[PDB]
Write a protein that binds this ligand. Structure first.
Ligand SMILES: CC1=C(/C=C/C(C)=C/C=C/C(C)=C/C=C/C=C(C)/C=C/C=C(C)/C=C/C2=C(C)C(=O)CCC2(C)C)C(C)(C)CCC1=O
Length: 137
């Protein structure tokens, strides 16, 4: 199911992908950054609208300096980066998702599948979910 889940995730639109990994992040709680630390500080320094745009840019695979930087990182550093962004959003340092937002049926189906996998399999899916975000020419 891991390759199938990765494949389906890759078909979701950017909004669904980004929403899914947010809710995946929140679920983990119920259970070092190498050269990415600076990028996190850059995002913390942006205003709320620009922070949201930055994260949307990554999921949309837009051509921006942050997206090019992101693309150069290892898979585990990309994961750690998103984890830290999640923490920062929870803490109020980075703009939160829209209030009252509901995960689409399509995204929910994928999230439900992920939650049924073994923990290692879940991380494999999430690692592959974020590895091709940002920009490659
Ligand atoms: C604007 C806007 C939105 C906004 C959406 C937004 C802003 C969404 C933001 C979503 C974010 C910030 C999601 C973060 C997810 C992080 C995960 C799952 C991390 C996993 C890490 C792992 C497994 C780490 C593992 C590891 C650790 C810890 C190590 O330390 C090393 C080991 C290892 C590698 C195994 C919406 C899309 C909702 C609506 C539309 C709309 O307009």
């Amino acid at each position: 199911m891991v390759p199938a889940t990765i494949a389906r995730f890759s078909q979701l639109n950017a909004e669904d992908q980004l929403a899914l990994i947010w809710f995946a992040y929140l679920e983990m709680g119920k259970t070092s950054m190498q050269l990415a630390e600076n990028a996190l500080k850059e995002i913390q320094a942006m205003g709320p609208l620009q922070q949201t745009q930055a994260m949307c840019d990554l999921a949309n695979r837009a051509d921006t300096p942050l997206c090019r930087t992101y693309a150069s990182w290892s898979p585990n550093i990309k994961l750690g980066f998103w984890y830290r962004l999640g923490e920062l959003m929870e803490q109020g340092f980075v703009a939160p998702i829209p209030a009252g937002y509901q995960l689409s049926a399509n995204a929910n189906a994928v999230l439900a599948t992920i939650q049924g996998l073994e923990s290692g399999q879940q991380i494999t899916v999430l690692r592959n979910a974020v590895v091709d975000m940002g920009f490659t020419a």
